[PDB]
């Protein structure tokens, strides 16, 4: 999982994101 713009991504999460993230997957 990732914690991003004050939200939080769950494990198995992947999406573009901007420069310079891009395209993340999250295994946590």
């Not at 990732?2 to 295994?27: I, K, N, R």
């Amino acid at each position: 999982g990732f914690c991003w713009h004050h939200s939080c991504v769950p494990s198995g999460t992947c999406a573009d994101f901007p420069w310079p993230l891009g395209h993340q997957c999250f295994p946590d």
